[PDB]
């Protein structure tokens, strides 16, 4: 039960007071704060409430929760004569603007006595909980007199002024538990997310986000399901996927796609203070990084980089595809238990010979990698995580597998390449096919640039976008998918060349990518990809050197009479930030007018990886990372990749 309410307060900095209400009403000094508003101006700090000691001398006794122009949630309690001074926050909290209105979020605290403990909550998710040893509640700070909506009185002035409007704004003289809370802010933000944490996969996190839209009209997504976090490595990484047959309106349960168990799909509490988010889970083989593409005959492909157990994406070896090759075949090397050099070869029907005697060996490798002898598979323990955080066997027998940190045999710690088919439009996919070592024998594979592939319409050739931090591998196959191949193009620099595709007209294709000189470079081909230009930049995007990953896909309806593309990518030099989403037309000689950019959020809002979709309805089906995951202070962070449309007109404003 509320001890105050009220609703439709709209404010311009200037606040509310609600002293004579809310004085004498907090007896035990805790208290629950639930806050439903839209902001009308995002710039500055913000305080939804404040209760504070409004005295002169007195400006650091108070209690808020404030918002940040970065979408920042937080809550301060402070006293001055103590100078006891808490902060609890989370990044990338809340929502601004969305198709220019002003958006409803609902967030609350939790502050409580019993635990010590000030928690956050927005739109459905608790953001934060932290213990704290000089907690204070409103009782334990000295000579409150002062209670106040949209900002905190601080010598008898009003500062973090709210701008907008407190919808509806409930105080509780009590901790409510976690569930009511949860519920309470519950809203349509809530919705728009796909996979949400401890799910149907078990991941706590995701990252890496593709969309794409199939010949029958059902849209799918994949994504990366990170389990132990959201490092890049070291991590337990499957893919998971999730598919729309109404427009995206609604949306499957996620199932995991590609995914080993040698550490099982569970949801680990991840840390993300300072001396625990640098932690990693160390041992688990993984899949990263998906890249889609639908064949002419409508047969559906999904690739993915592969990483055996404890190889990290900087102590895989680079001069070792991990294929040996006999008499002009390719054949995956291994290594035994007890041997240094790699003596065997995984050739037909999974059959593992010994290479010196040339051989075949009793045992065999399946079509997942697992590893049998006399057809009977050999088994290992698999690890659980405990937090200090421990790794350990935990009883269970998963089948032993070439990619594992226990198994008999191992492939070369390196990275690899694997390619699923699916027949039935991504409800059912083929066991997973290792990539030839297309770079050469001597050099590892690629790594992909995710979101999706596409087919050249006068060629019929497949173009896989990957890079190997030097270049650009431009990996295609002109047989329908039997085979292939790759264009390997040096680049100028040392770029994590993460691209995507776009066909002007026929046989005329760009690759759009990331670059280390804070530009978007774009390279053109006039043969289907077989020959490529020197690089061009856009002029419009200034980003960070670091770079970030882009979405660019061609849209099949005409614009202002035009055909179109349509580009996502963050543009921001202080950050992962400032999302757009980008029209350019094409015109008659293949130069293309950038005409329209629709801003997503506000400017100093998180937006990472991204991808678009063309709906079958001609809207755009937006999903991306809404936050900063770059930052070392973002990561780990449940809830923040959500899905969007727009409509043309929509992008057409900014
Ligand atoms: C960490 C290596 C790579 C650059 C070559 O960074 C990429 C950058 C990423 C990023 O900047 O967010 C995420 C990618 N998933 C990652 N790729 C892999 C394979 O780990």
Same mark, same amino acid.
């Given at each position: ?69 970065? +979408? ?12 006891? %001074? ?111 944490? &401890? ?47 109404? &427009? ?65 994406? @900087? ?53 997942? =990698? ?16 405990? =937090? ?24 070369? /710690? ?8 699916? %027949? ?18 001597? @050099? &590892? ?28 591998? =431009? ?16 680049? /100028? ?81 202080? +950050?992962?930030?400032? +999302? ?75």
């Amino acid at each position: 039960t509320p001890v105050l309410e009220k609703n439709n307060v709209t404010l311009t900095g200037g606040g509310e007071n609600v002293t004579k209400e809310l004085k004498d009403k907090f007896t035990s000094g805790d208290f629950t704060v639930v806050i439903k508003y839209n902001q009308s101006s995002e710039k500055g700090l913000q305080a939804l409430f404040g209760i504070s000691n409004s005295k002169p001398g007195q400006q650091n006794s108070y209690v808020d929760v404030f918002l940040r122009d970065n +979408g920042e949630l937080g809550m301060e309690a402070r006293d001055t004569s103590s100078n006891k %001074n808490n902060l609890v926050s989370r990044p990338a909290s809340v929502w601004g603007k969305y198709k220019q209105e002003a958006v409803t979020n609902t967030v609350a605290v939790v502050a409580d006595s019993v635990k010590k403990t000030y928690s956050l909550y927005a739109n459905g998710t608790k953001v934060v909980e932290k213990k704290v040893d000089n907690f204070l509640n409103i009782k334990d700070i000295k000579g409150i007199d002062y209670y106040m909506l949209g900002g905190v009185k601080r010598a008898g002035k009003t500062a973090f002024g709210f701008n907008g409007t407190l919808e509806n704004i409930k105080f509780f003289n009590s901790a409510l538990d976690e569930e009511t809370v949860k519920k309470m802010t519950t809203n349509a933000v809530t919705g728009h997310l796909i996979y949400t944490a &401890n799910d149907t996969t078990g991941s706590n996190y995701f990252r890496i986000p593709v969309l794409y839209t199939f010949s029958n009209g059902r849209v799918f997504s994949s994504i990366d399901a990170r389990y132990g976090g959201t490092h890049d490595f070291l991590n337990k990484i499957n893919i998971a996927t999730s598919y729309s047959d109404d &427009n995206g309106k609604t949306w499957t349960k996620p199932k995991l796609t590609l995914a080993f168990d040698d550490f099982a799909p569970v949801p680990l509490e991840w840390p993300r203070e300072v001396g625990g988010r640098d932690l990693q889970i160390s041992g688990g083989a993984t899949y990263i990084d998906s890249v889609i593409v639908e064949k002419k005959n409508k047969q559906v492909l999904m690739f993915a980089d592969v990483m055996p157990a404890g190889v990290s994406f @900087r102590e895989a070896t680079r001069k070792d595809s991990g294929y040996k090759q006999i008499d002009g075949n390719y054949y995956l090397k291994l290594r035994k238990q007890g041997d240094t050099d790699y003596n065997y070869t995984i050739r037909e029907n999974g059959t593992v010979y010994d290479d010196r005697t040339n051989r075949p060996t009793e045992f065999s490798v399946d079509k997942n =990698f697992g590893i049998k002898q006399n057809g009977n598979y050999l088994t290992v323990e698999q690890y659980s995580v405990s =937090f200090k955080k421990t790794e350990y066997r935990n009883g269970t027998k998963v089948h032993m597998n070439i990619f594992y940190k226990d198994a008999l045999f191992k492939v070369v /710690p390196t990275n690899y390449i694997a390619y699923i088919s699916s %027949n039935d439009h991504g409800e059912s996919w083929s066991a997973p096919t290792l990539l030839p070592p297309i770079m050469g024998l001597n @050099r &590892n594979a690629p790594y992909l640039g995710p979101g999706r592939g596409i087919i050249e319409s006068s060629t019929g050739r497949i173009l896989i976008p990957s890079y190997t931090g030097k270049e650009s591998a =431009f990996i295609y196959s002109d047989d329908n998918g039997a085979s292939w191949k790759v264009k390997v193009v040096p680049l /100028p620099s040392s770029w994590s060349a993460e691209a995507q595709f776009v066909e002007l007209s026929p046989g005329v294709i760009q690759a759009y990518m990331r670059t280390n000189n804070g530009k978007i470079a774009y390279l053109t081909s006039k043969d289907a990809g077989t020959t490529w230009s020197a690089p061009e930049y856009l002029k419009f995007v200034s980003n960070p050197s670091y770079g970030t990953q882009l979405s660019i896909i061609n849209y099949s309806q005409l614009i202002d009479g035009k055909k179109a593309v349509i580009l996502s990518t963050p543009n921001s030099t202080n +950050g992962r930030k400032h +999302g757009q989403i980008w029209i350019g037309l094409i015109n008659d000689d293949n130069t293309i007018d950038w005409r329209y950019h629709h801003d997503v959020d506000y400017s100093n809002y998180g937006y990472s990886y991204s991808t678009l979709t063309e709906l079958p309805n001609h809207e755009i089906g937006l999903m991306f990372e809404k936050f900063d995951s770059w930052s070392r202070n973002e990561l780990h962070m449940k809830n923040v990749v959500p899905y969007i449309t727009f409509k043309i007109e929509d992008l057409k404003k900014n």
